[PDB]
Amino acid sequence: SRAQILCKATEYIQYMRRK
Amino acid sequence: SRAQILCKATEYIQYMR
Amino acid sequence: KRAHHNALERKRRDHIKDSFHKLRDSVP
Amino acid sequence: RAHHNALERKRRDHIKDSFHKLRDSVP
DNA sequence: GTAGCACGTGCTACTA
DNA sequence: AGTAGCACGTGCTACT
Ligand SMILES: NC(=O)CN1C(=O)CCC1=O
Numbered sequence: 001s002r003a004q005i006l007c008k009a010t011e012y013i014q015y016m017r018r019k
Numbered sequence: 020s021r022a023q024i025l026c027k028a029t030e031y032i033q034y035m036r
Numbered sequence: 037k038r039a040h041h042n043a044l045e046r047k048r049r050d051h052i053k054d055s056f057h058k059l060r061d062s063v064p
Numbered sequence: 065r066a067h068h069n070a071l072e073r074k075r076r077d078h079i080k081d082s083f084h085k086l087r088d089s090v091p
Numbered sequence: 092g093t094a095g096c097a098c099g100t101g102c103t104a105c106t107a
Numbered sequence: 108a109g110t111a112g113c114a115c116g117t118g119c120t121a122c123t
């Protein structure tokens with residue numbers, strides 16, 4: 001789902017950018 | 020952009036991982 | 037009737053375009 | 065027109081392709 | 092009865 | 108001037 005894909009990458013970028 | 024954003028994101032993720 | 041659907045899809049595109057802008061803001 | 069339409073069909077497809085490449089990158 | 096999708100257009104914007 | 112890029116309208120399946 002396009003909404004789900006955007007949310008994922010966005011939530012994984014945010015997490016992984018704070019390590 | 021939209022396409023710019025997906026490439027940038029895909030490529031940013033590819034490098035951090 | 038259907039304009040209700042066209043207006044509702046306008047909110048969905050706005051939602052996707054919102055998520056595009058959010059994802060872009062998280063990547064340098 | 066058909067030519068215009070034909071390019072956008074192909075441009076959309078490249079956007080979807082770019083959407084599936086991003087879902088496959090993140091765990 | 093709404094959500095996700097992809098399509099056919101028309102408009103602005105960028106490319107040789 | 109052609110090709111990108113975007114948003115709309117709109118007619119689909121499919122889910123919850
Ligand atoms: N913008 C955000 O980060 C919050 N959010 C959404 O809107 C969908 C998934 C998610 O985590």
Ligand SMILES: NC(=O)CN1C(=O)CCC1=O
Binds near residue numbers: 025026027029030085
């Ligand atoms: N599979 C890939 O080449 C990765 N990629 C591209 O080619 C453009 C930027 C992007 O996301």
